[PDB]
Amino acid sequence: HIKEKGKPLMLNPRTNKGMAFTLQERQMLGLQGLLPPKIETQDIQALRFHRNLKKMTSPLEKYIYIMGIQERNEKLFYRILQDDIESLMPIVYTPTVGLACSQYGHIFRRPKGLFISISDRGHVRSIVDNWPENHVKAVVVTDGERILGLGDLGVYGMGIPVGKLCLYTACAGIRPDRCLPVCIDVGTDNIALLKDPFYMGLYQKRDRTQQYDDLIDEFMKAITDRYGRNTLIQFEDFGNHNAFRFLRKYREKYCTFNDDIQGTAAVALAGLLAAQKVISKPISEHKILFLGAGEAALGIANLIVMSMVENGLSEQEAQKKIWMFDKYGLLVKGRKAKIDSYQEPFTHSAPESIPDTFEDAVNILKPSTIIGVAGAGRLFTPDVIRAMASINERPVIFALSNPTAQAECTAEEAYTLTEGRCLFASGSPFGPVKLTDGRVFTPGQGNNVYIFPGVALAVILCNTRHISDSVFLEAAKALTSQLTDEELAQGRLYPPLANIQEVSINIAIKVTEYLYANKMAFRYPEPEDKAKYVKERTWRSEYDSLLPDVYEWPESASSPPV
């Protein structure tokens, strides 16, 4: 049921088609004369915008162009996004979305998403009621505090949820109606933004008192009051500590998951399973040394332990295979540095040497896998890579810190200081590495877009209210299952991004099959086959006919005379 006609129909991106309005539905809907005479298809529109896009050279001009397309016509926007997804995820999402936020601030002409300020505390529900859309299933919330590679940006961080929500629809098929980007702005610590008179938000510094926590609680309550307790809420580019503690707080009472703790863990585990298929030995035979003992490292280690346990190994024996190296030093029993409750499982009896630097820890533990999530910088020194290559026939090196400037090492050093026998994976993109021997090795990129769209779609479709830790184990197994035998022969650890739209759906299916198996899905009746269930509820970018049904009634009896 479309209730619009004429010019309003073309001012709504949801119902706009541009020139794809056929002649008969131009004439019946009152659009004749308001559009140029040509009748086009969506293929022609997509081709026009694709070549206009190839003519452009900077990523940021491409970003402005493609978001303008999103604002004028959303079906065409998502068709263009799905057509060339590998080349446009770096544009629509990180890293270009952060540059767009930093430099052009708020490009958008239309109001996309809510702005909730600390000045609105006690009245968040009215702000949420101002949003026209009545059914939203996914909410992405930003603080602006930690933009990836840009730092604090305040209100300008609003472009980060928007872009991310695009991926929700471009890869998973979540309806754009059902997505709400939110910016919780509590001030900014960026003095550059506090000095200029054209900053678009509060001119105070970040509120770090109890008012911030109360505002977050009130916003969560308002969102789930209007939209339901099973609304998926993601905290995107919050402060690191804030994001971690909010994930702990709202994990049980709300449907939230984190990409930094849970998505990164799932992607790292998928890479590890791919590596265990590439190399002869399984994941249980590995010995993992972590660089960093934060909550992202703990999430990855817990997921690895769950994977080890499900393969027949005991929990304690699994945890004895993971070693974690803090900034202070190796986590061992009896060290003078403070160790909290969550690092207790991975605190082990100290080795004889008691290493003080990371390279010494690599030499003394002889670990097969090395995983860097510290985020400090180039902590994977060349000596570390050389020691890894010497100890292991085929070392597994994971530099999961992002952006590139914060990665533990780059693919070039990893693949050169080794003879190419290392299985290197990184969060940040890297170019293929060519050696003097003549071979070319492409490093697997642990993109978070592998996990969160499929998991979000499965959670939204199944009416899940609590996203557990084993959902991401199932997602990691599903992601690994997408790799073919020839891909493993070529040494790829992840499926190519070019078919993410397929991979995501497959992931969703597996997660769906898990959620109904573990009674964490509240959408009944339970579908007989989950694949056909999820594949008919994804959003299609094909235009819908707006043509009124005009037909002739069969002739009936004549009306009687008066």
Ligand X SMILES: NC(=O)c1ccc[n+]([C@@H]2O[C@H](COP(=O)([O-])OP(=O)(O)OC[C@H]3O[C@@H](n4cnc5c(N)ncnc54)[C@H](O)[C@@H]3O)[C@@H](O)[C@H]2O)c1
Residues belonging to the active site: 93, 164
Judged on CB neighbours under 10 Å (0-12, 13-18, 19+), 282 is middle
Q: Does 31 bind a second copy (CB under 8 A)?
A: yes
295 phi/psi in degrees, rounded to 5: -75, -30
CA of 429: how far to CAs of 410, 434, 445, in Å?
A: 9, 16, 6
Q: Candidates 55-63, 101-109, 299-307, 458-466 — which segment interacts with ligand X by CB under 6 A?
A: 458-466
- Shortest Å, Cβ 185 to ligand X: 27
Q: Which of 201, 398, 206, 203 is nearest to 290 (CA)?
A: 398
Q: Does 46 bind a second copy (CB under 8 A)?
A: no
Q: Does 201 bind a second copy (CB under 8 A)?
A: yes
Among 135, 253, 333, 532, binds ligand X (CB under 6 A): 135
Q: Does 5 bind a second copy (CB under 8 A)?
A: yes
Among 66, 85, 155, 339, binds a second copy (CB under 8 A): 155
Q: Does 30 bind ligand X (CB under 6 A)?
A: no
- Shortest Å, Cβ 233 to a second copy: 16
- Interface positions, 532-551, toward ligand X (CB under 6 A): 537-539
- Shortest Å, Cβ 177 to ligand X: 7
What is the Cα Rg of the chain in Å?
Answer: 26
Question: How many angstroms separate the CA atoms of 85 and 497, rounded?
Answer: 8
- Positive or negative, the CA dihedral 208, 147, 191, 117 is negative
H helices present in 343-499, as ranges: 358-365, 382-391, 411-416, 452-461, 470-481, 485-490
- Shortest Å, Cβ 275 to ligand X: 34
Token pair recorded at residue 281: 């030995």
What is the crossing angle of helices 96-104 and 59-72, to 10°?
80
Q: Which of 81, 106, 95 is nearest to 147 (CA)?
A: 95
Q: Does 116 bind a second copy (CB under 8 A)?
A: yes
447 is in an annotated binding site: yes
Token pair recorded at residue 186: 């509590």
Judged on CB neighbours under 10 Å (0-12, 13-18, 19+), 192 is exposed
- Shortest Å, Cβ 204 to a second copy: 5
240 is in an annotated binding site: yes
Q: Answer with the entry of ligand X, a second copy, none that 537 interacts with (C-beta below 5 to 8 A by kind).
A: ligand X
Q: Does 446 bind ligand X (CB under 6 A)?
A: no
Nearer Cβ to ligand X (348/523):
523
Q: Does 44 bind a second copy (CB under 8 A)?
A: yes
What is the crossing angle of helices 42-55 and 59-72, to 10°?
160
DSSP assignment string, 99-125: HHHHHH----SS--SEEEEGGGTT-HH
Q: Does 228 bind a second copy (CB under 8 A)?
A: no
Q: Which of 442, 437, 391, 438 is nearest to 414 (CA)?
A: 442
- Interface positions, 281-320, toward ligand X (CB under 6 A): none
Q: Candidates 104-112, 141-149, 301-309, 414-422 — which segment interacts with a second copy by CB under 8 A?
A: 104-112
Nearer Cβ to a second copy (187/491):
187
402 is in an annotated binding site: yes
Nearer Cβ to a second copy (182/497):
182
Contact 182, 114 (CB under 8 A): yes
Q: Candidates 66-74, 238-246, 380-388, 443-451 — which segment interacts with a second copy by CB under 8 A?
A: 66-74
Give 332's strand partners. 348
121 is in an annotated binding site: no
Among 62, 75, 175, 321, binds ligand X (CB under 6 A): 175
Give 180's strand partners. 139
Q: Answer with the entry of a second copy, ligand X, none that 192 interacts with (C-beta below 5 to 8 A by kind).
A: none
Contact pattern from residue 540 through residue 559 relative to a second copy, giving x for each residue in contact according to CB under 8 A and a dash for the rest: --------xxxxxxx-xxxx
Q: Does 190 bind a second copy (CB under 8 A)?
A: no
Q: Answer with the entry of a second copy, ligand X, none that 3 interacts with (C-beta below 5 to 8 A by kind).
A: a second copy
Known binding-site positions for a divalent metal cation: 236-237, 260
User: Using CB under 6 A as the criterion, which residues of the chain lie in contact with ligand X when the complex forms?
Assistant: 134-135, 137, 173-175, 178, 228, 460-461, 463, 523, 537-539
